[PDB]
CSV table of C-alpha atoms in Angstrom, one decimal:
chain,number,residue,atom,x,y,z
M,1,UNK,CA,17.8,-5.1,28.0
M,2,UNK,CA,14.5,-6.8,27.6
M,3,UNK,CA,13.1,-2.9,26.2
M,4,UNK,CA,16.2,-2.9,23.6
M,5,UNK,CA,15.3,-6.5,22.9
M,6,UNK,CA,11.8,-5.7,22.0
M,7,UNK,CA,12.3,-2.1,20.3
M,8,UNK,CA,15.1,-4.2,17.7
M,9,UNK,CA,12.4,-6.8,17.4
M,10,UNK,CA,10.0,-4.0,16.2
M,11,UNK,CA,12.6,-1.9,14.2
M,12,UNK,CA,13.2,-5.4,12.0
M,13,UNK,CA,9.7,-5.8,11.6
M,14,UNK,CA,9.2,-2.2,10.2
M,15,UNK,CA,12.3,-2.9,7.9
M,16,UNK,CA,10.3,-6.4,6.3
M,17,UNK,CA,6.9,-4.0,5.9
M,18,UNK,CA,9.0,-1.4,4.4
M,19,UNK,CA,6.9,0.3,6.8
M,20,UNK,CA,7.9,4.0,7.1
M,21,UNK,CA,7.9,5.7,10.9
M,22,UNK,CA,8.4,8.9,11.4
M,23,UNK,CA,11.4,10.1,13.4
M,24,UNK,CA,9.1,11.6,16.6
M,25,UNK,CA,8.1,8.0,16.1
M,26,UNK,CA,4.6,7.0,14.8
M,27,UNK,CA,3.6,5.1,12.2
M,28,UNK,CA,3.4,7.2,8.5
M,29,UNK,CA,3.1,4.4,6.1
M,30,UNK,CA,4.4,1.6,4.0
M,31,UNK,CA,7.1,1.7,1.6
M,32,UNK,CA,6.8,0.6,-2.2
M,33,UNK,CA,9.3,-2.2,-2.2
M,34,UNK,CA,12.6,-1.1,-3.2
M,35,UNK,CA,14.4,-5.1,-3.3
M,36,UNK,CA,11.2,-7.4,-3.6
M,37,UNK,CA,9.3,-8.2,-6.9
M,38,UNK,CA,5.3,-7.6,-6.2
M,39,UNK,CA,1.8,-6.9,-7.3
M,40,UNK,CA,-0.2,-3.6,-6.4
M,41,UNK,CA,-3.6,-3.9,-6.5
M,42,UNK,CA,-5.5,-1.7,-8.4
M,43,UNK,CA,-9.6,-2.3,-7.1
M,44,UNK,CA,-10.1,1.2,-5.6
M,45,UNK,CA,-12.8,-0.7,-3.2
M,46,UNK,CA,-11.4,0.2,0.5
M,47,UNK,CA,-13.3,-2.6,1.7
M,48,UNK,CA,-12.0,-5.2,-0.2
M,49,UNK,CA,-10.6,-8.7,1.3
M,50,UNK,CA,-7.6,-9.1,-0.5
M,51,UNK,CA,-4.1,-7.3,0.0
M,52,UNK,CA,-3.3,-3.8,-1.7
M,53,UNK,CA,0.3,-5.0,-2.0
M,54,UNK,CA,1.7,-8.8,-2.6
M,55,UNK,CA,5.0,-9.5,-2.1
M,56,UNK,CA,5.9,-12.0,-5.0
M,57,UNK,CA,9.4,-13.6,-3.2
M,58,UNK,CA,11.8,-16.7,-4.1
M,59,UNK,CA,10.2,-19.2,-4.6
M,60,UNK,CA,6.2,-20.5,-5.2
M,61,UNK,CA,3.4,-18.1,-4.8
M,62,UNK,CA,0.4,-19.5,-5.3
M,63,UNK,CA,-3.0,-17.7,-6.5
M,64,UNK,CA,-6.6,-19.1,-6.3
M,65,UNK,CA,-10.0,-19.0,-5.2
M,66,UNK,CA,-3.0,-21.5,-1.4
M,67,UNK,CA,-1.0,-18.3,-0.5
M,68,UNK,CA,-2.7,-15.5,-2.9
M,69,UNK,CA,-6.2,-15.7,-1.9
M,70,UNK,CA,-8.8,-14.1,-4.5
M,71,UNK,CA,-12.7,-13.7,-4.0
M,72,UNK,CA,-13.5,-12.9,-7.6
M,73,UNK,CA,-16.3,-15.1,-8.9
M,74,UNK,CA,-14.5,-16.6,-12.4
M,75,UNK,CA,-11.0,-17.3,-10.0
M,76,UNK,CA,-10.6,-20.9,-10.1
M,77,UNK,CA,-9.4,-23.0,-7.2
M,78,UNK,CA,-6.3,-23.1,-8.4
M,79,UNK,CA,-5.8,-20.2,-10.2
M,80,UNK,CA,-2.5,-19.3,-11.6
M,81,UNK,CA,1.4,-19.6,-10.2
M,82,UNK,CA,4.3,-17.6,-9.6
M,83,UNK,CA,7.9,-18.6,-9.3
M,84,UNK,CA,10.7,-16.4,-8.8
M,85,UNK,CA,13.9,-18.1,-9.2
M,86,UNK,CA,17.7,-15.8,-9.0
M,87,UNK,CA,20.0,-18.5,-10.2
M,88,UNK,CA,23.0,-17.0,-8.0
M,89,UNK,CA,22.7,-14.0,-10.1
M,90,UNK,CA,22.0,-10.3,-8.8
M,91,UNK,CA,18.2,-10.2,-10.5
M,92,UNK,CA,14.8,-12.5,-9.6
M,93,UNK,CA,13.3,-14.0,-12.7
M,94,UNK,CA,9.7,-14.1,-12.4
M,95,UNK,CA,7.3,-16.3,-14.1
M,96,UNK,CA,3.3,-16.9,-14.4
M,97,UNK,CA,2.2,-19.9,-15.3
M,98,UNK,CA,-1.7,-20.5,-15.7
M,99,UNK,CA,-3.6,-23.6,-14.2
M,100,UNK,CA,-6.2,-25.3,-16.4
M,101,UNK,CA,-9.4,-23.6,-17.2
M,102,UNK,CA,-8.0,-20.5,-15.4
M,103,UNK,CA,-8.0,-17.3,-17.7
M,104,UNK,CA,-5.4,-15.2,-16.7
M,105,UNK,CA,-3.6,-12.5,-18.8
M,106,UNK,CA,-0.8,-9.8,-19.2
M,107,UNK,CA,-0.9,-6.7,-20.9
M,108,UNK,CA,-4.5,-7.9,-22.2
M,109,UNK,CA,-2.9,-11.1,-24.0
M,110,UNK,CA,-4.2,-14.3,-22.1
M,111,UNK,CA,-1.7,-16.7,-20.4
M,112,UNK,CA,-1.5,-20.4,-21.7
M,113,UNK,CA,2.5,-21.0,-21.1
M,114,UNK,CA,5.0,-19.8,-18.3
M,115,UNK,CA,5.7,-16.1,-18.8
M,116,UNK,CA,8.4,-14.2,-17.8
M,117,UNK,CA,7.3,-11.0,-16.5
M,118,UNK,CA,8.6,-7.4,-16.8
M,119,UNK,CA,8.4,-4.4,-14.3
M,120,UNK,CA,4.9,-2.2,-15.4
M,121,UNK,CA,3.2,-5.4,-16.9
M,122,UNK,CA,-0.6,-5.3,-15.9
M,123,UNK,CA,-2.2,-8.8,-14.9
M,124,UNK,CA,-5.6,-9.7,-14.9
M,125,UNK,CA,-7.3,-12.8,-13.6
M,126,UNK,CA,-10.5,-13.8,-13.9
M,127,UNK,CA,-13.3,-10.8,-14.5
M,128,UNK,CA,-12.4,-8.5,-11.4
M,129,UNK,CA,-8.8,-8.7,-10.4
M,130,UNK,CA,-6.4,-6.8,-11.8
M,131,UNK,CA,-2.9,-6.1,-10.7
M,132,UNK,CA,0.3,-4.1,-11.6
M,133,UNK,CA,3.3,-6.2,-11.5
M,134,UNK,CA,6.7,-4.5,-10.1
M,135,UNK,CA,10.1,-5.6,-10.5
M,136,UNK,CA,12.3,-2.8,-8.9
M,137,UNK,CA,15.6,-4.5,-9.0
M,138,UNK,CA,14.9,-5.0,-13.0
M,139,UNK,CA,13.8,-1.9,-13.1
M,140,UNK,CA,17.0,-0.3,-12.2
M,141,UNK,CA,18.4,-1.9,-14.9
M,142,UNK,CA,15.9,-1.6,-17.3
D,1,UNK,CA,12.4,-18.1,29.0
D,2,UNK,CA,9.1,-18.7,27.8
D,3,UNK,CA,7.7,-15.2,29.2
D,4,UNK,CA,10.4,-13.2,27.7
D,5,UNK,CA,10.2,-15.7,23.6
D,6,UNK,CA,6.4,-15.2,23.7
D,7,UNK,CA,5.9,-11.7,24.6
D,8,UNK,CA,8.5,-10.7,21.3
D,9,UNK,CA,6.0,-13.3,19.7
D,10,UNK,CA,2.7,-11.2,21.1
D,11,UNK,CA,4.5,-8.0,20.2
D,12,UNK,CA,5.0,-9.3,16.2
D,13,UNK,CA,1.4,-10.9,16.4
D,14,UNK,CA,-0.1,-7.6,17.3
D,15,UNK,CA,2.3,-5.3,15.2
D,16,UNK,CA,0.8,-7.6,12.3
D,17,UNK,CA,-2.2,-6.9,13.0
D,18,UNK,CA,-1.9,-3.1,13.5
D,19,UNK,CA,0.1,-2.6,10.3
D,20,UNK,CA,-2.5,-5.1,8.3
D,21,UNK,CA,0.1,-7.4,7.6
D,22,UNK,CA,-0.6,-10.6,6.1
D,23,UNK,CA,1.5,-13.5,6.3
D,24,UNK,CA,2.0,-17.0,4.4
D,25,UNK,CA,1.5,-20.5,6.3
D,26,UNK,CA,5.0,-21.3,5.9
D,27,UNK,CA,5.2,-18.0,7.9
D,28,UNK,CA,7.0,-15.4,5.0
D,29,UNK,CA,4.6,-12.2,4.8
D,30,UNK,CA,2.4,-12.5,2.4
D,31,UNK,CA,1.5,-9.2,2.0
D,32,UNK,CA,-0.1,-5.5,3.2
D,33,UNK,CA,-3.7,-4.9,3.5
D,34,UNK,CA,-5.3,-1.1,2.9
D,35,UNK,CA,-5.9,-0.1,6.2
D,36,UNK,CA,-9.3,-1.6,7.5
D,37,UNK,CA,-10.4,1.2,10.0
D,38,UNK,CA,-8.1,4.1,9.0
D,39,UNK,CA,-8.2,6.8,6.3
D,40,UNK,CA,-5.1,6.8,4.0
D,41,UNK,CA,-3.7,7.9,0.8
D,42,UNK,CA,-2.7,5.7,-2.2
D,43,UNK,CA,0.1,6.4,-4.6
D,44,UNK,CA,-1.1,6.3,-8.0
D,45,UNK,CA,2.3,7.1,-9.3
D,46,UNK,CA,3.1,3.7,-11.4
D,47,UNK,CA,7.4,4.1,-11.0
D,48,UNK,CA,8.6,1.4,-8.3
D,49,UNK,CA,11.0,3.1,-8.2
D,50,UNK,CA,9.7,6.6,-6.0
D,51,UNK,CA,10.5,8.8,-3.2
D,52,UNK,CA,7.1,8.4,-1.5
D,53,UNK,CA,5.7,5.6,0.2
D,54,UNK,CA,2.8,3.6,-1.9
D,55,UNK,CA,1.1,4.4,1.3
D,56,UNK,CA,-0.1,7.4,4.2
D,57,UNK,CA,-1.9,7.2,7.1
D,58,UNK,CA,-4.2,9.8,7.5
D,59,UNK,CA,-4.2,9.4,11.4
D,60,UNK,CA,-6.6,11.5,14.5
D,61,UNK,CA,-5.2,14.6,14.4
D,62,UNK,CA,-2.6,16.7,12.3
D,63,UNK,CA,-0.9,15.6,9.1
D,64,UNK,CA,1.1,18.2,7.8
D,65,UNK,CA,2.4,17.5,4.0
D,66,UNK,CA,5.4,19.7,2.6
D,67,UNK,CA,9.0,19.2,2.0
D,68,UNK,CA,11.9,17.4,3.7
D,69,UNK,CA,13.9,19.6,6.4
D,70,UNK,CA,12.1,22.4,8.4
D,71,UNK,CA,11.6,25.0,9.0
D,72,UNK,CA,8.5,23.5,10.9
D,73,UNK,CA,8.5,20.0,10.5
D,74,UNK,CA,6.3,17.9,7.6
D,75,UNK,CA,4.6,14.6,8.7
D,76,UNK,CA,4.3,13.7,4.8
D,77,UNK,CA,7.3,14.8,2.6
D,78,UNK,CA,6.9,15.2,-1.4
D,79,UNK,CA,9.8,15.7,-3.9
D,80,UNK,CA,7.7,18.1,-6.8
D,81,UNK,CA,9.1,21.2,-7.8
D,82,UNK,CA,5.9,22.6,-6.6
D,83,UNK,CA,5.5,21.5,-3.2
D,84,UNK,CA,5.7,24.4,-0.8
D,85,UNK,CA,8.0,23.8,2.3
D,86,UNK,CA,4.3,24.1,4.1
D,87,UNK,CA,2.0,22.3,1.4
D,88,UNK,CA,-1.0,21.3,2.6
D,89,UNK,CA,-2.5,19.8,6.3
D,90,UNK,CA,-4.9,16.8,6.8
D,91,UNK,CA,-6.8,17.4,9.8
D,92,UNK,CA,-8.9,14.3,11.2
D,93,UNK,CA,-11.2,14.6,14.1
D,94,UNK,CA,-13.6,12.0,15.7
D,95,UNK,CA,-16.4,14.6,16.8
D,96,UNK,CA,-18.1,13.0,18.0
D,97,UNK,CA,-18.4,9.7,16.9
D,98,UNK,CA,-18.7,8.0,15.3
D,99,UNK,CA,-16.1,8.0,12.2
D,100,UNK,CA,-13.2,10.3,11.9
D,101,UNK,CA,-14.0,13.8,9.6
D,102,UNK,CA,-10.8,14.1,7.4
D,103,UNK,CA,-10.7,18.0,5.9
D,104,UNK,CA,-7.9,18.9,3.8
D,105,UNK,CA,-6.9,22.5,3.9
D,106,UNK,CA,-4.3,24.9,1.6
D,107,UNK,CA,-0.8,26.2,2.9
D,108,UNK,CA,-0.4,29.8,1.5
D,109,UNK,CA,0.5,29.4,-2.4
D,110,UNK,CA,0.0,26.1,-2.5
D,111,UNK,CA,-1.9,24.0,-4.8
D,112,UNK,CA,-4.1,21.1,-4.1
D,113,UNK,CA,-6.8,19.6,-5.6
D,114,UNK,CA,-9.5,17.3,-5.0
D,115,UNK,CA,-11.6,15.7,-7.9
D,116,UNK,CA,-10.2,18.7,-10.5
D,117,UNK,CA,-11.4,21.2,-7.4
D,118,UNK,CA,-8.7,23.7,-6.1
D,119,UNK,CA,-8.7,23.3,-2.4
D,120,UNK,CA,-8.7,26.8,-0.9
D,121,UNK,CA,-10.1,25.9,2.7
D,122,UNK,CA,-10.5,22.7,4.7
D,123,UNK,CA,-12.7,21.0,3.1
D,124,UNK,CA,-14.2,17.3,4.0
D,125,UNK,CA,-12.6,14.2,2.0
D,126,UNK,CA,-14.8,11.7,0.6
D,127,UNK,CA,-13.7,8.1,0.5
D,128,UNK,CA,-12.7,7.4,-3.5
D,129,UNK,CA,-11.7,11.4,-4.1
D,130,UNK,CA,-8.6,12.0,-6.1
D,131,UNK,CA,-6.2,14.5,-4.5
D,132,UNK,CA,-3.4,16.6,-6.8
D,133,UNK,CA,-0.4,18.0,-4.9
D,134,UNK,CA,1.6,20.3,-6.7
D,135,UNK,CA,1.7,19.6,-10.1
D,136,UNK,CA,3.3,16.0,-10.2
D,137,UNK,CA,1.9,14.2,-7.0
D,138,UNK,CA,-1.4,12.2,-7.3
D,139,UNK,CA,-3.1,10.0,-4.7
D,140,UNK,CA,-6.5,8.3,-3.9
D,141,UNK,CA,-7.7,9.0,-0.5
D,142,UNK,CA,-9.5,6.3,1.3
D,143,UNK,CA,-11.8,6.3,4.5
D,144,UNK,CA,-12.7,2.8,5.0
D,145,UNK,CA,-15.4,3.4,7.9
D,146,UNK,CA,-16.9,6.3,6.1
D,147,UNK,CA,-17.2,3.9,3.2
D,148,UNK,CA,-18.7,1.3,4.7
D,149,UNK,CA,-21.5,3.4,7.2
D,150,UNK,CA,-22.4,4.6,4.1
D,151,UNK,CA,-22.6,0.7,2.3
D,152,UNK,CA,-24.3,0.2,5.3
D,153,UNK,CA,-27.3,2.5,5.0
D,154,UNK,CA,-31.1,1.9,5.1
């Protein structure tokens, strides 16, 4: 019972990474998310510090020099924000709001009010990070 | 009991850590980390909405890429109307020490390309190169300890 216990425990776990296992059983990698809004990182530097995937769920992510930690030298302390908020409906809305003094921008165009966001938008903030934002839900309906 | 709660929490602590899993203070995950001591494959296809994962581990041993359903079984499975049932194989071996060797090697009538090169017999990756499968499948291949001994020389 306590093995059952423990191999549920680990097949929810692989569910919330998206993480794909083979069937013989090992580990073969992680899932684009199919239900969760997020940001894929595009430095190509395999020794970075931050995460190649963010998940961006209900809710407040914050982004700053906070939840979304960035080591790019122009990233403020507080940086930027992201809210996702459903409203009982079937589809997140995201938004990005800038904090002060914080350059931040989408599709090239710099951020000075909340922004709704749409699936294939490219963020950048600061010099060095830049980010594709996904939206697969919207997507789908796009 | 307390043996039986904390060794499902030691089990999600270390599964965290394996999987390079990062997670919020108010405990939601956060996040996945590239693989800090494994060689992988990124996705560079930009539609959220694919068939592949965003992510492969490129693991000791075999990796055989092809498509779904046998004959012999694929480790790595790819949708393009050019992917041979046998595609390509990854091969990774630690010899003998201290990072892993990655070669990539052809299937017969298979294409695959590193940096523009057709791949016609295992040849070693290189942490940054740019692999084609097929005609439509397109990943960055990674070796994170390669990478760094090399950042690391004098």
């Amino acid at each position: 019972e306590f093995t059952e216990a423990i191999r549920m425990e680990r097949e929810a776990l692989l569910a919330e990474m998206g993480v794909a296992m083979r069937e013989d059983g090992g580990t073969l990698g992680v899932f684009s998310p199919k239900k969760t809004p997020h940001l894929v990182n595009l430095n190509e530097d395999p020794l970075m510090s931050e995460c190649l995937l963010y998940y961006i769920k209900d809710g407040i992510t914050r982004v700053g020099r906070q939840d979304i930690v960035l080591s790019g030298h122009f990233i403020k302390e507080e940086h930027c924000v992201f809210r996702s908020d459903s409203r009982g409906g079937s589809e997140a809305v995201v938004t990005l709001e800038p904090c002060e003094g914080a350059d931040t921008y989408v599709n090239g165009k710099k951020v000075t009010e909340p922004s709704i966001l749409r699936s294939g938008n490219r963020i950048i903030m600061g010099k060095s990070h830049v980010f594709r934002f996904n939206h697969p839900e919207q997507a789908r309906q796009e």
